Amino acid sequence: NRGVIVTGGGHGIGKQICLDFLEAGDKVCFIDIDEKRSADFAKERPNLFYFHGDVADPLTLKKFVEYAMEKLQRIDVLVNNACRGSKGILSSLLYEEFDYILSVGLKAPYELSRLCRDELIKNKGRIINIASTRAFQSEPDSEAYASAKGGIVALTHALAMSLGPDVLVNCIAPGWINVTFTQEDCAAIPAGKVGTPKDISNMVLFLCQQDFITGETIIVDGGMSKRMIYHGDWNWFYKID
Amino acid sequence: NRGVIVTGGGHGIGKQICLDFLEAGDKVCFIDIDEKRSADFAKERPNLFYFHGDVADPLTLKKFVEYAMEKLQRIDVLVNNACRGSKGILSSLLYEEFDYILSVGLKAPYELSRLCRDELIKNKGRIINIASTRAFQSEPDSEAYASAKGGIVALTHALAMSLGPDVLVNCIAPGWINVTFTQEDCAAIPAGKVGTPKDISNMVLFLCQQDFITGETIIVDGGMSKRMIYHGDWNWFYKID
Amino acid sequence: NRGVIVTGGGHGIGKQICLDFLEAGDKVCFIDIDEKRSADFAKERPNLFYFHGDVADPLTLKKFVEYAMEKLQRIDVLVNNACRGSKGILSSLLYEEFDYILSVGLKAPYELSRLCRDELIKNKGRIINIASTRAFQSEPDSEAYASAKGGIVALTHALAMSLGPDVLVNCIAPGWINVTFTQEDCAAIPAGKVGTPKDISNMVLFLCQQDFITGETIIVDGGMSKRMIYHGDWNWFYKID
Amino acid sequence: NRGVIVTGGGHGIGKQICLDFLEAGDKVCFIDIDEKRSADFAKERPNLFYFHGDVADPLTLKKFVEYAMEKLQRIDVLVNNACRGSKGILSSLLYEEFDYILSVGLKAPYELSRLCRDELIKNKGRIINIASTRAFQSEPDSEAYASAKGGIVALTHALAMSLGPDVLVNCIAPGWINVTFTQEDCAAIPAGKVGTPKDISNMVLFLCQQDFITGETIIVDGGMSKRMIYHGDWNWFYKID
Ligand SMILES: NC(=O)c1ccc[n+]([C@@H]2O[C@H](COP(=O)([O-])OP(=O)(O)OC[C@H]3O[C@@H](n4cnc5c(N)ncnc54)[C@H](O)[C@@H]3O)[C@@H](O)[C@H]2O)c1
Ligand SMILES: NC(=O)c1ccc[n+]([C@@H]2O[C@H](COP(=O)([O-])OP(=O)(O)OC[C@H]3O[C@@H](n4cnc5c(N)ncnc54)[C@H](O)[C@@H]3O)[C@@H](O)[C@H]2O)c1
Ligand SMILES: NC(=O)c1ccc[n+]([C@@H]2O[C@H](COP(=O)([O-])OP(=O)(O)OC[C@H]3O[C@@H](n4cnc5c(N)ncnc54)[C@H](O)[C@@H]3O)[C@@H](O)[C@H]2O)c1
Ligand SMILES: NC(=O)c1ccc[n+]([C@@H]2O[C@H](COP(=O)([O-])OP(=O)(O)OC[C@H]3O[C@@H](n4cnc5c(N)ncnc54)[C@H](O)[C@@H]3O)[C@@H](O)[C@H]2O)c1
Ligand code: NA
Ligand code: NA
Ligand code: NA
Ligand code: NA
Structure with missing residues (x-):
C-alpha cells in the first residue's frame, strides 16, 4: 500500500511508529545509526527495510532515499523522528557539537523533505515531524536541543505552506515518553502517567489520515506544559541545593 | 457503551459528533434550541436522546443533565459544542448581547462541567470543548465571539489541571467548516478544501480515546492560520473600497 | 496632556499605573470598589479623579465614563486593570459567581471599550488590558479566573483588529506581582525576584507610546512560564501529601 | 557606561540599535560583512567600533569578541541581529545553503552567547535576539528562514533559563520593517503603517532596562499576524495566477 520512511526507527518512538505502519499494511524503510538493534528489528519482517547511517550526513540522506525508493518503489509518508539530546551553554557545548545537533534535528528533516519533494507531491503524501515540548519551555543547559526543536516547529509550517495542498505537514511535540x-x-504529570511510544505513534497515524490539518504542532505531554507551577503552591517545591 | 452528552447536537458539527458516537456504539443525549430539526434527528434512533433548551439558562443546564442521567444512567463524555456567531464593537454590540454570547460559549461549558464533575471523575471521563481559530486571530467586529472562544481555550487547561488525572479535557479550534x-x-486555504463536520468529529473521537493529551487546543483549519499574508505577495491582495 | 481612565486604580498595579501617568503629566480618572483607600489615593492630587463603583454593573460603567469625560474632557487611554481572584470547579464555584468574575474581568473591558469607542478613535488613542499568565497555564481550581483572562487575551486582538489603525490595543500578562x-x-523564579507594580506600569506606558505594536499579549513574569519543570529534575520536587 | 555588541550593525535595524545605544551613552562594537557601509557608519563616532567579518564563521566570532573586549573592555549587552533571508524547498535550496542560513541566524547567536557567557554573568547583562514573525507563520518557499527564526525563538528561552537570574534574555519578532x-x-497592516528600525530599537533598549521579563518573544508587526484573513472577506482577496 503506502511507502513509509522513518528516521531513528530502530528504537523507542520511531520503532513503534514503524510497527504501527507495518500493522496498517504499509511497507516501511527506516534509517538508524544503531546497526545491531536495527538489523534485529528488521529481521524476518519482509515489509520492513533497514538502512544503516547517520542522518547528520547529507550524502547519507541521499543514499538513504535512493535505497528506500528501491525497496518501497514509492514514498507516501516521511516521518522525521531522529534526534539525540545534549547539553548547552552551562556545559559550554562547543560550536561543532551544537552544529551536529542541528544537523540531526533540523537539517535532516529539511533535506529529506527536499529529496522527497516531487515524490510526495505526486503521491499527495504526508510529512510528520517529531519535536518536543522543549521547543516551548526550557530546563537549564538545553540550548542545542531547544534550537533544533524550535527550528523544526517552524520548519513544519514552512513546509506545510510550501507543499499544500498536495502534501500536508504536521508536528508532534512529545513530553516524557518512556523509551526504556x-x-x-506519575502524580506530578496532570494525566497521572508517563507517556509511551504508542501515545505518539497513534497521533502519527491519525494525522497522516486527516486532510484538514496542516502546519500544526500538537503537544502530547500528559498536560505537563499546561501546569502552572509556583514554589510552595499545589504540591510543588523548589529546593536550593 | 459510553454515555455521551453534546451541546448544539441538532446540526452541523454537533450533529456529526452525535452520529460518530452512535456509530461507535455509545448512547448520546444532546441539547439544542432548534426543536423541529433536533426532534427529526433523534426520531427512530433509539440511542439518541434530544432535550430542547437554551444552554444560556443555568436552570435549563441542570434540568438537561438530569434528563441525560435518566436516559443514559451514566456520563462518560461531555462535548461542549453549542455557540452562535455575533458582531462586536463596530456594530456597538450591546452589553446584554455580549453577555448572552458568553453565557452560551463560556458559562455553559463551565456549568455543565461543574454539574457533571463527580460523574466524570468517577467514570474517568473526557471533556471536549469546541472553540475556533477566532480565539487566536480576529476579523473586525468579532469581540463577543473572540472573548467566548479565548475564554474556552483557557477554561480547557483550567479544567484539565483541576480534574486530572481522572478526567482529560481538550479543545478543538476549527477553521472554516461547511455546515451548509x-x-x-478552496485554493486560498493551504490544505486546498473547505472543512467538514467529519474533520472535527474524527478529532473529537480520537481525543476521547487518548490518555496522554490533556489541556491542549488543536487547530483544525486546513492551515489557514499558519499562512503569512502580506498585500501584493503570494497571491493575496488587500482592496480598499 | 492625555486623559487616562484606569479600572482598579485604588491599589496594587492599577495604583502604580495611575501614578506613572500622573508623573508623565496626564490627568487620570479611576474607578474602584474600595472607597476609603481610593479617596485617600486621590486626596490632594488635583489631576487624579476617583469614581466609586463596581465595574461589574453596566450602569456604573456608563456613569463612570460620563464622570471621566466631565473631569478629563477627553479620553486618550483606557486601561482595563480591575479583577479579583476566585476559585473554580473543585470548590464547585456557583454559576452566578463564575458569571461575576466574567463581569469584572471580561464584560467590563468590552463595555468600557464600547462606551469609549468614538472618543478613542477620534483621539487616536490606546487600550491596555491587564491579563495574567493564568491565561496560558493553570493551577487546579482556577476555572473562573482562567476563563476571564483567556477571554481578555482574545478580546485584545479582536479590539485591535476592529479599531486599527486609529486605536492600538495591547495586553500585559503579569506573573507574580507583589501587591503587599x-x-x-525568589530563587524559583528564573529572573530571581518577585515582580513589582512598576514592572507592569513601565510596560503600560511603553506600550502606549509605540505605534507598531497592536493585538499582542506580553508576558511579564520573570520567565516563570518558560521554565520546564519535571519532578526530581533541576531543583523542583512534587510532594504528595 | 555599558559595553554593547551588535551583529549586523552596519545597516537597517542593527544600525538604528547601534545609534540608540550610542545616544544612551554606551560604547558599541558591531560586526558586519559589508565593509564600506560599516566603516562609514563608524567614521568619526569615537564610541562606535566596527569589526569586518562573517558571523557564519566560528573563528571570526571569537576574534570579534576578542576585538570587542579590547575596544569596550566590558560586555554588558549582546544583540543578535544579523540575518539574510533566502528561499526554500520550492527553489530546492541546497543543504549547504540551508546550513549557511542556520550558521548566520542560529549558530552565531548561540556561539556569541557562549563566548560572552562569563562576562555577561559577571556584569549581570542582557541578550536580545532579533527573530521575525516568520517564526510563527509562513509564506511558501521560506524553509531556511523559518527554521533559523523558529530556532532562535526557542534558543531565547533556553538561554534565559540557563543564565537567569544574572542574565535576562529576550527576543523581538519584527514584521515588515522598512530598511530601504x-x-x-499601509492600509493592509492593522496599525496602518509600515514599521521602522526605530520601532525595533525602542523595544531593544526598553527590554534591556527591565528586570522582570525573560525568555519572552515580543511581536512587533503592526498587528499583521493577529489579522484573520479569509478570501472574499473584510477587504482581502486571493487571486489564482
Ligand atoms: N523520549 C522523550 O522523552 C522525548 C521527548 C521529546 C522529544 N522526543 C523526540 O522523539 C524523537 C525520538 O527520540 P526517542 O526518545 O525515541 O530517542 P531514542 O534514543 O530512544 O531513539 C532515537 C533513535 O534514533 C537513532 N538516531 C539517533 N541519532 C541518529 C542519527 N544521527 N542518524 C540516524 N539515527 C539516529 C537512535 O539510534 C535511536 O534508535 C526525537 O526526535 C526526540 O527529540 C522524545
Ligand atoms: N462552522 C464553522 O466554520 C466553525 C468555525 C469555528 C468554530 N465553530 C464552532 O463549532 C461549534 C458548532 O457550530 P456550528 O458551526 O456547527 O454551528 P451550526 O449553526 O451549524 O450549529 C450549532 C447548533 O447549536 C445550536 N445552538 C445555538 N445556540 C444554542 C443555545 N444557546 N442553546 C442550545 N443550542 C444552541 C443550534 O441550533 C445549532 O443546531 C460552535 O461552538 C462554533 O463556535 C464552527
Ligand atoms: N498581583 C498579581 O500577582 C497579578 C498576576 C496576574 C494578573 N494580575 C492582574 O492585575 C490586575 C490588578 O490586580 P492586583 O494584583 O493589583 O489586585 P489588587 O487587589 O492589589 O488591586 C485590584 C484593585 O481593583 C479593585 N477592584 C476589584 N474588583 C473591582 C470591581 N469589581 N470594581 C471596581 N474595582 C474593583 C480593588 O479594590 C483593588 O483596588 C488584575 O486584573 C489582575 O487580574 C495580577
Ligand atoms: N526587515 C524586515 O522586514 C525584518 C523582518 C523580520 C525579521 N528581520 C530580522 O531583522 C534582522 C536585521 O535584518 P534587516 O532587515 O536589518 O536586514 P538588512 O539587510 O537591512 O541588515 C542586516 C545587516 O546584517 C549584515 N549581515 C548579513 N549577513 C551577515 C553575516 N553573515 N555576517 C556579518 N554581517 C552580516 C548585513 O550586511 C546588513 O548590514 C535580521 O535578523 C532579520 O532576520 C527583519
Ligand atoms: Na526485513
Ligand atoms: Na430518539
Ligand atoms: Na483628587
Ligand atoms: Na569610530
Missing part, C-alpha cells in the same frame, strides 16, 4: 517510576513521577 | 464554493475559496 | 519572601520564593 | 509604499501596503 516513583508515585511522584 | 469558488475555485478561490 | 523566602530564599526559595 | 502604496495606500494598500
Whole structure:
C-alpha cells in the first residue's frame, strides 16, 4: 500500500511508529545509526527495510532515499523522528557539537523533505515531524536541543505552506515518553502517567489520515506544559541545593 | 457503551459528533434550541436522546443533565459544542448581547462541567470543548465571539489541571467548516478544501480515546492560520473600497 | 496632556499605573470598589479623579465614563486593570459567581471599550488590558479566573483588529506581582525576584507610546512560564501529601 | 557606561540599535560583512567600533569578541541581529545553503552567547535576539528562514533559563520593517503603517532596562499576524495566477 520512511526507527518512538505502519499494511524503510538493534528489528519482517547511517550526513540522506525508493518503489509518508539530546551553554557545548545537533534535528528533516519533494507531491503524501515540548519551555543547559526543536516547529509550517495542498505537514511535540517510576513521577504529570511510544505513534497515524490539518504542532505531554507551577503552591517545591 | 452528552447536537458539527458516537456504539443525549430539526434527528434512533433548551439558562443546564442521567444512567463524555456567531464593537454590540454570547460559549461549558464533575471523575471521563481559530486571530467586529472562544481555550487547561488525572479535557479550534464554493475559496486555504463536520468529529473521537493529551487546543483549519499574508505577495491582495 | 481612565486604580498595579501617568503629566480618572483607600489615593492630587463603583454593573460603567469625560474632557487611554481572584470547579464555584468574575474581568473591558469607542478613535488613542499568565497555564481550581483572562487575551486582538489603525490595543500578562519572601520564593523564579507594580506600569506606558505594536499579549513574569519543570529534575520536587 | 555588541550593525535595524545605544551613552562594537557601509557608519563616532567579518564563521566570532573586549573592555549587552533571508524547498535550496542560513541566524547567536557567557554573568547583562514573525507563520518557499527564526525563538528561552537570574534574555519578532509604499501596503497592516528600525530599537533598549521579563518573544508587526484573513472577506482577496 503506502511507502513509509522513518528516521531513528530502530528504537523507542520511531520503532513503534514503524510497527504501527507495518500493522496498517504499509511497507516501511527506516534509517538508524544503531546497526545491531536495527538489523534485529528488521529481521524476518519482509515489509520492513533497514538502512544503516547517520542522518547528520547529507550524502547519507541521499543514499538513504535512493535505497528506500528501491525497496518501497514509492514514498507516501516521511516521518522525521531522529534526534539525540545534549547539553548547552552551562556545559559550554562547543560550536561543532551544537552544529551536529542541528544537523540531526533540523537539517535532516529539511533535506529529506527536499529529496522527497516531487515524490510526495505526486503521491499527495504526508510529512510528520517529531519535536518536543522543549521547543516551548526550557530546563537549564538545553540550548542545542531547544534550537533544533524550535527550528523544526517552524520548519513544519514552512513546509506545510510550501507543499499544500498536495502534501500536508504536521508536528508532534512529545513530553516524557518512556523509551526504556516513583508515585511522584506519575502524580506530578496532570494525566497521572508517563507517556509511551504508542501515545505518539497513534497521533502519527491519525494525522497522516486527516486532510484538514496542516502546519500544526500538537503537544502530547500528559498536560505537563499546561501546569502552572509556583514554589510552595499545589504540591510543588523548589529546593536550593 | 459510553454515555455521551453534546451541546448544539441538532446540526452541523454537533450533529456529526452525535452520529460518530452512535456509530461507535455509545448512547448520546444532546441539547439544542432548534426543536423541529433536533426532534427529526433523534426520531427512530433509539440511542439518541434530544432535550430542547437554551444552554444560556443555568436552570435549563441542570434540568438537561438530569434528563441525560435518566436516559443514559451514566456520563462518560461531555462535548461542549453549542455557540452562535455575533458582531462586536463596530456594530456597538450591546452589553446584554455580549453577555448572552458568553453565557452560551463560556458559562455553559463551565456549568455543565461543574454539574457533571463527580460523574466524570468517577467514570474517568473526557471533556471536549469546541472553540475556533477566532480565539487566536480576529476579523473586525468579532469581540463577543473572540472573548467566548479565548475564554474556552483557557477554561480547557483550567479544567484539565483541576480534574486530572481522572478526567482529560481538550479543545478543538476549527477553521472554516461547511455546515451548509469558488475555485478561490478552496485554493486560498493551504490544505486546498473547505472543512467538514467529519474533520472535527474524527478529532473529537480520537481525543476521547487518548490518555496522554490533556489541556491542549488543536487547530483544525486546513492551515489557514499558519499562512503569512502580506498585500501584493503570494497571491493575496488587500482592496480598499 | 492625555486623559487616562484606569479600572482598579485604588491599589496594587492599577495604583502604580495611575501614578506613572500622573508623573508623565496626564490627568487620570479611576474607578474602584474600595472607597476609603481610593479617596485617600486621590486626596490632594488635583489631576487624579476617583469614581466609586463596581465595574461589574453596566450602569456604573456608563456613569463612570460620563464622570471621566466631565473631569478629563477627553479620553486618550483606557486601561482595563480591575479583577479579583476566585476559585473554580473543585470548590464547585456557583454559576452566578463564575458569571461575576466574567463581569469584572471580561464584560467590563468590552463595555468600557464600547462606551469609549468614538472618543478613542477620534483621539487616536490606546487600550491596555491587564491579563495574567493564568491565561496560558493553570493551577487546579482556577476555572473562573482562567476563563476571564483567556477571554481578555482574545478580546485584545479582536479590539485591535476592529479599531486599527486609529486605536492600538495591547495586553500585559503579569506573573507574580507583589501587591503587599523566602530564599526559595525568589530563587524559583528564573529572573530571581518577585515582580513589582512598576514592572507592569513601565510596560503600560511603553506600550502606549509605540505605534507598531497592536493585538499582542506580553508576558511579564520573570520567565516563570518558560521554565520546564519535571519532578526530581533541576531543583523542583512534587510532594504528595 | 555599558559595553554593547551588535551583529549586523552596519545597516537597517542593527544600525538604528547601534545609534540608540550610542545616544544612551554606551560604547558599541558591531560586526558586519559589508565593509564600506560599516566603516562609514563608524567614521568619526569615537564610541562606535566596527569589526569586518562573517558571523557564519566560528573563528571570526571569537576574534570579534576578542576585538570587542579590547575596544569596550566590558560586555554588558549582546544583540543578535544579523540575518539574510533566502528561499526554500520550492527553489530546492541546497543543504549547504540551508546550513549557511542556520550558521548566520542560529549558530552565531548561540556561539556569541557562549563566548560572552562569563562576562555577561559577571556584569549581570542582557541578550536580545532579533527573530521575525516568520517564526510563527509562513509564506511558501521560506524553509531556511523559518527554521533559523523558529530556532532562535526557542534558543531565547533556553538561554534565559540557563543564565537567569544574572542574565535576562529576550527576543523581538519584527514584521515588515522598512530598511530601504502604496495606500494598500499601509492600509493592509492593522496599525496602518509600515514599521521602522526605530520601532525595533525602542523595544531593544526598553527590554534591556527591565528586570522582570525573560525568555519572552515580543511581536512587533503592526498587528499583521493577529489579522484573520479569509478570501472574499473584510477587504482581502486571493487571486489564482
Ligand atoms: N523520549 C522523550 O522523552 C522525548 C521527548 C521529546 C522529544 N522526543 C523526540 O522523539 C524523537 C525520538 O527520540 P526517542 O526518545 O525515541 O530517542 P531514542 O534514543 O530512544 O531513539 C532515537 C533513535 O534514533 C537513532 N538516531 C539517533 N541519532 C541518529 C542519527 N544521527 N542518524 C540516524 N539515527 C539516529 C537512535 O539510534 C535511536 O534508535 C526525537 O526526535 C526526540 O527529540 C522524545
Ligand atoms: N462552522 C464553522 O466554520 C466553525 C468555525 C469555528 C468554530 N465553530 C464552532 O463549532 C461549534 C458548532 O457550530 P456550528 O458551526 O456547527 O454551528 P451550526 O449553526 O451549524 O450549529 C450549532 C447548533 O447549536 C445550536 N445552538 C445555538 N445556540 C444554542 C443555545 N444557546 N442553546 C442550545 N443550542 C444552541 C443550534 O441550533 C445549532 O443546531 C460552535 O461552538 C462554533 O463556535 C464552527
Ligand atoms: N498581583 C498579581 O500577582 C497579578 C498576576 C496576574 C494578573 N494580575 C492582574 O492585575 C490586575 C490588578 O490586580 P492586583 O494584583 O493589583 O489586585 P489588587 O487587589 O492589589 O488591586 C485590584 C484593585 O481593583 C479593585 N477592584 C476589584 N474588583 C473591582 C470591581 N469589581 N470594581 C471596581 N474595582 C474593583 C480593588 O479594590 C483593588 O483596588 C488584575 O486584573 C489582575 O487580574 C495580577
Ligand atoms: N526587515 C524586515 O522586514 C525584518 C523582518 C523580520 C525579521 N528581520 C530580522 O531583522 C534582522 C536585521 O535584518 P534587516 O532587515 O536589518 O536586514 P538588512 O539587510 O537591512 O541588515 C542586516 C545587516 O546584517 C549584515 N549581515 C548579513 N549577513 C551577515 C553575516 N553573515 N555576517 C556579518 N554581517 C552580516 C548585513 O550586511 C546588513 O548590514 C535580521 O535578523 C532579520 O532576520 C527583519
Ligand atoms: Na526485513
Ligand atoms: Na430518539
Ligand atoms: Na483628587
Ligand atoms: Na569610530
